[PDB]
Design a protein around this ligand. Sequence first.
Ligand SMILES: CN(C)C(=O)c1cnn(C)c1C(=O)Nc1ccn2cc(-c3ccccc3)nc2c1
Ligand SMILES: [Cl-]
Ligand SMILES: [Mg+2]
Ligand SMILES: [Zn+2]
Length: 313
Amino acid sequence: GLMQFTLPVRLCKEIELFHFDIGPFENMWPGIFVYMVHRSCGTSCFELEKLCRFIMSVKKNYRRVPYHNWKHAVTVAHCMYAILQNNHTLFTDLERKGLLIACLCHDLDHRGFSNSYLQKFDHPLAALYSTSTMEQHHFSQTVSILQLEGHNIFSTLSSSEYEQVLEIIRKAIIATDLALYFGNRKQLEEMYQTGSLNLNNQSHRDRVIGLMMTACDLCSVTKLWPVTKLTANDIYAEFWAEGDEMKKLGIQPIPMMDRDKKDEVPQGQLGFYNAVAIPCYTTLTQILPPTEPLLKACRDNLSQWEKVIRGEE
Ligand SMILES: CN(C)C(=O)c1cnn(C)c1C(=O)Nc1ccn2cc(-c3ccccc3)nc2c1
Ligand SMILES: [Cl-]
Ligand SMILES: [Mg+2]
Ligand SMILES: [Zn+2]
């Protein structure tokens, strides 16, 4: 009970900031996650023996891929930790528990390929889950790991509290399907602009949690430029292997996944920032003002990509 996780001073202080990078030491990441749960939720919410065993099983089921890996899981969790901790009063007890766990599990057993490619390949998962294919898989993995003996970190919840948390986790994970982001943000934009936004309406909270999940998932765009730039190399390493795989099916891939169009990445980034990233963080700061520091870092990174196009780096 009285065994609190502590971080070295620099991490203890910087972990609280939105732009914290979790570092290149793999074996410190589970520690960093528990630290965040204990501070965000409390030292009671999970039994440590069960929580440590769940983290290590989750870790085992992320694959050694360039981007969609264990580091991404912990990184996405840290961004949510920072939102929760800057918006203390807005979230329930179940929400703080479920969301750190959703984020850690939100890409479980990712193979480094898009839903689109799974469909063009005719992968069996595309047959089982016709929309949001990889995301329904991520949740299915999350449930299977909770059901391993001694892994049920939610064991002490009541049947209704347990069903509520699993439902928060499912919705949270499905929302990381970027194909669903566009409509969600639009509705939230509309509801914020007409004053209809009501955090006591559950369908409204669901949408706000969705937008949070997108924001945590895209959060490489909110880091220090050198983090943002080097993460982009890993992101493209996956895109370009997917394009290779597309060309093996006799399909010309989109420029994003064509390593031949490597020259045009900078412009492709400006489009992603304007089309996806900046709208996401703008709407999130409208709804939750203390997340403004994500919008500001994202705008700085847009300007860094513009300095790349102009030949200033
Ligand atoms: C994980 N994921 C799915 C992401 O989208 C994601 C998450 N974080 N970040 C930073 C991204 C990301 O890079 N998005 C995009 C989206 C469209 N593009 C188009 C091009 C492009 C076009 C022409 C030429 C060369 C490249 N490049 C991109 C990149
Ligand atoms: Cl606190
Ligand atoms: Mg995903
Ligand atoms: Zn992700």
